[PDB]
């Protein structure tokens, strides 16, 4: 019966070598005596390499190992909304069982050229520095990259939390469901994240998938694919999803552990040769599908942690090459009160204006031009007095705008609240306001606009475009404020 049932030859470090199993499929699951599960990654002329999803203490030499006939799959459906699930869809929140519309394989093939449609609709983060300078679209892949403790999870979570204004809506075309994949994180961090999402009522549209540090390395390697397969249900059923990976560097570390203990030869930085193929067939499963295939979308926000700010490292070098853009977070900006600490010069989007709200585009163009001028002159920032008139003016406006882009944590903004502010900044009104009062400005101005000029916000929201009849009234309404301020 060796075709169905093999014997363990050797076991250790989470890797078992099984004799027999002549018919086993690559990446198929095996069930050991004592019930521990494993994934058959290596098929060799006379033995099979199983990576154990659990503690190796249970497996002993001589163990009978029986094949399942099942490539690893996870449950999918809407009943997962509001739940915390492990890398295989098992509930770990204790609220009870999952109800699933079906099951989907982990490593399904991404959609091809033909069924896609171009990214043309926005993933509204509510962060000024993103929506106005590095827009994210539905169907995009944006890498949140930065050193430790720089603001990445904050960006992803503000993006999650800002969807509350649409997801309570009835128009299913605007609401965006969320999936958060915690790879390598400790369980207490997920506890705090679920607390934040519960406080804000965001759990009802969020699925959390948790391959925590204590989880076996195979499950940390596998969790992103299963979370992707969970989001792909919303994609394939005409719904919209945002999958955040926090973070893919640790999936790479787990894949390295697996590979090295399987005695595969290492490449650069001790990583395996095919880590690019690991992340690539993960990320570009994100797609924007055409009406023929249900108009659905899946948006990916992979996090990467850069040691010493070095983007020359192997996994950053790979993932920067797979993604459509990058939000670069830097600590020198954090400690200067620029929070979120987005380096507008290193950050880029390859989808660009197409993904942007039209009203915000109409001003982000000039915003970007002026901040580029500032990035050029900034070396001379401190000795502002002795410079030329034009350089002094550029320094002034750029510093006021950089201060303008900051905003508090867990306080996302609507685009109706972003447009007036970026307008007042671009069109020079803020030049007379001391750099310290800009925080008092954006708070006291919106409160004014909401009170005395509500129709401007209502039309910016409803119509989506700044009409001239409206842009002139916005100029009027900004002059009617800077005067009192």
């Amino acid at each position: 019966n060796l075709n169905e049932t093999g014997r363990v030859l050797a076991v250790g470090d989470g890797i078992a070598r099984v004799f027999g199993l002549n018919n086993i499929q690559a990446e198929e699951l095996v069930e050991f005596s004592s019930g521990v599960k494993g994934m058959a990654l290596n098929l060799e002329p006379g033995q099979v390499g199983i990576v154990l999803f659990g503690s190796d203490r249970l497996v002993k030499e001589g163990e009978l190992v029986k094949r399942t006939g099942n490539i690893v799959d996870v449950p999918v459906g809407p009943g997962l909304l509001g739940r915390v699930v492990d890398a295989l869809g098992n509930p770990i929140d204790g609220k009870g069982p999952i109800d699933a519309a079906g099951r989907s394989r982990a490593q399904v093939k991404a959609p091809g050229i033909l069924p896609r449609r171009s990214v043309h609709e926005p993933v509204q983060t509510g962060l000024k520095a993103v929506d106005a300078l590095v827009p994210i679209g539905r169907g995009q892949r944006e890498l949140i990259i930065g050193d430790r403790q720089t603001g990445k999870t904050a960006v992803a979570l503000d993006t999650i939390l800002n969807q509350k204004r649409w997801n309570n809506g009835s128009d299913e075309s605007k609401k965006l469901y969320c999936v958060y994949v915690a790879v390598g994180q400790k369980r207490s961090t997920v506890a705090q994240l679920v607390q934040t999402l519960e406080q804000h009522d965001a759990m009802k549209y969020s699925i959390i998938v948790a391959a925590t540090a204590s989880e076996a390395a195979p499950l940390q390697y596998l969790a992103p694919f299963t979370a992707a397969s969970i989001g792909e249900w919303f994609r394939d059923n005409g719904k919209h999803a945002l999958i955040v990976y926090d973070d893919l560097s640790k999936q790479a570390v787990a894949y390295r552990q697996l590979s090295l203990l399987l005695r595969r030869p290492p490449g650069r930085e001790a990583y395996p040769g095919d880590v690019f193929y690991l992340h690539s067939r993960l990320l570009e499963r994100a797609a924007k599908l055409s009406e023929k295939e249900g108009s659905g979308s899946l948006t990916a926000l992979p996090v990467i942690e850069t040691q010493g700010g070095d983007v020359s490292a192997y996994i950053p070098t790979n993932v920067i090459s797979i993604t459509d853009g990058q939000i670069f977070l830097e600590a020198e900006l954090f400690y200067k009160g620029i929070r979120p600490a987005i380096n507008v010069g290193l950050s880029v989007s390859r989808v660009g204006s197409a993904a942007q709200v039209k009203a915000l585009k109409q001003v982000a163009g000039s915003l970007k031009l002026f901040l580029a001028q500032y990035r050029e002159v900034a070396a001379f920032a401190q000795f502002g007095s002795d410079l030329d008139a034009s350089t002094k003016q550029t320094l002034v406006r750029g510093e006021r705008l950089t201060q303008l882009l900051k905003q508090n944590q867990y306080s996302p903004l609507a685009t109706e609240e972003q447009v007036p502010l970026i307008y007042a900044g671009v069109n020079g009104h803020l030049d007379g306001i001391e750099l310290s009062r800009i925080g008092e400005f954006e708070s006291s101005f919106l409160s004014y606009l909401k009170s005395n000029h509500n129709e401007l916000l209502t039309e910016i929201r409803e119509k989506g475009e700044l009409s001239k009849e409206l842009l002139a009234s916005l100029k009027s309404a900004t002059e009617s404020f800077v005067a009192t301020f």
Partner: protein, 469 residues
């Protein structure tokens, strides 16, 4: 027929055994009749015990120890002909556009030897491109390798589109596009824009063939797609008797996939992690891109520079082969001039008096001198102002700004989004038009008259029409 059985499956690598004692040759293609489509494997090593080691052209998941494998009798054979135009072809020669089979008469191996020394062209030759900045400062070579350095955000896709339009339509010829690890979204966008521009037609004649190897595909495919398109380009050369141009996007991923396949095959990694065969693999790809008596396969290659390090072995090895460079830099769109080609970092081997003529070399040299003088004074212009400059350097900066702007050009394909009509300029009308600016004849005119104007004969008119407003 030669039938074998699988013995190992480790990632993208598969080992096959041929008990009948007739082993397949290296670079031959073997087939496994999987439930979904078929799985193609390229032989990479003979290892003894009648065992051969192969690189998979598709996912190896689902394979079983003991599965049959059938030898095809040769290397991966792509379809070739005019029936390839408008179609999208994968690495193994199969249509992925869902628009039916390819009824071609012939199929050609993706592995073929470069032309002999006796067959090569004896002299360089200039590719009139219709873009001022290209054919003034960094002109392209017929049958050469041109390297494009820049992301999508800076106009890369529309630059490729305008090249396909100007060379293939105004001058005449076909074109081949090869996505080696291209992002699938960009490929859908390119297909859609090419349908919008009339290079692809479904119910009629079309004049570009598409080979797409997506980034999701295993390293063995990305390592071979470039040859898949290069073979079609070579067929249109040697069997259609016409000059063609081959786009490879992006050439970095050819070397990346080579490094993956080498590491998987157990070859000792070299420097920062590339294959020892890096230079020879690049050579065996590039040196098919050359001029022969029957025609020239020209190439425009996008080159991804990781971490902006031109000293990384991948771009360093690519540079040895290409002789024209075109840097699309964000630092030029930040100040709002398109095509956004850096007039100074962009350079060409063919900018020689023996090729372009002395009249052109003088103009180009004085342009690269004025722009560089301006790029020298910027600190001075900032900390001080433009009043401190001498009257000489004030004129130099004026003419440098006018030249910086005049290098801008509205594309015949931007007519939809920018609205601007789009125009192309000959090399004479450009060389003389810049000679007239350097000679100071049109120093009377403001800078704005130069901004989106294809030639000075229209800068005069724009000046008049602006002054009349």
């Amino acid at each position: 027929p030669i039938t074998g059985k699988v013995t190992a499956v480790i990632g993208a690598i598969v080992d096959v055994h041929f008990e009948q004692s007739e082993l397949p040759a290296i670079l031959n293609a073997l087939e496994i009749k999987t439930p979904q489509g078929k799985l193609v494997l390229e032989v990479a090593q003979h290892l003894g015990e009648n065992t051969v080691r192969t690189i998979a052209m598709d996912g190896t998941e689902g394979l079983v120890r003991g599965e049959k494998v059938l030898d095809t009798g040769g290397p991966i054979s792509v379809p070739v002909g005019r029936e390839t135009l408008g179609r999208i072809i994968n690495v193994i020669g199969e249509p992925i556009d869902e628009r039916g089979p390819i009824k071609s008469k012939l199929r050609k191996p993706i592995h073929a030897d470069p032309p002999s020394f006796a067959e090569q062209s004896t002299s360089a030759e200039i590719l009139e491109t219709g873009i001022k900045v290209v054919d003034l400062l960094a002109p392209y070579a017929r049958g050469g390798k041109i390297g494009l350095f820049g992301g999508a955000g800076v106009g890369k896709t529309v630059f490729i589109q305008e090249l396909i339009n100007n060379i293939a339509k105004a001058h005449g010829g076909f074109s081949v596009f090869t996505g080696v690890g291209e992002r699938t979204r960009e490929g859908n966008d390119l297909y859609r824009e090419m349908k919008e521009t009339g290079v692809i037609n479904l119910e009629g004649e079309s004049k570009v063939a598409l080979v797409f190897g997506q980034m999701n595909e295993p390293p063995g495919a990305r390592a071979r797609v470039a040859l898949t398109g290069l073979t079609i380009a070579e067929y249109f050369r040697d069997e259609e008797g016409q000059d063609v141009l081959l786009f490879i996007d992006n050439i970095f991923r050819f070397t990346q996939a080579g490094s993956e396949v080498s590491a998987l095959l157990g070859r000792i990694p070299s420097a920062v992690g590339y294959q020892p065969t890096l230079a020879t693999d690049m050579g065996l790809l590039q040196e098919r891109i050359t001029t022969t008596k029957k025609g020239s396969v020209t190439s425009v290659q996008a080159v991804y520079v990781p971490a902006d390090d031109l000293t990384d072995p991948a771009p360093a090895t690519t540079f040895a082969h290409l002789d024209a460079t075109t840097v699309l830099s964000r630092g030029i769109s930040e100040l709002g001039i398109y095509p956004a080609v850096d007039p100074l970092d962009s350079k060409s081997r063919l900018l020689d008096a023996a090729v372009v003529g002395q009249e052109h070399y003088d103009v180009a040299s004085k342009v690269q001198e004025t722009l560089q003088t301006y790029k020298s004074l910027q600190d001075i212009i900032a900390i001080l102002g433009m009043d401190e400059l001498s009257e000489q350097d004030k004129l130099t900066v004026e003419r440098a700004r006018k030249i910086q702007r005049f290098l801008s050009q509205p594309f015949a394909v931007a007519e939809v989004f920018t609205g601007i009509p789009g125009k192309l300029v000959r090399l004479k009308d450009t060389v003389a038009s810049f000679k007239a600016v350097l000679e100071g004849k049109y120093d009377n005119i403001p800078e704005h008259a130069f901004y989106m104007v294809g030639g000075i004969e229209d800068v005069v008119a724009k000046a008049e029409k602006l002054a009349a407003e």
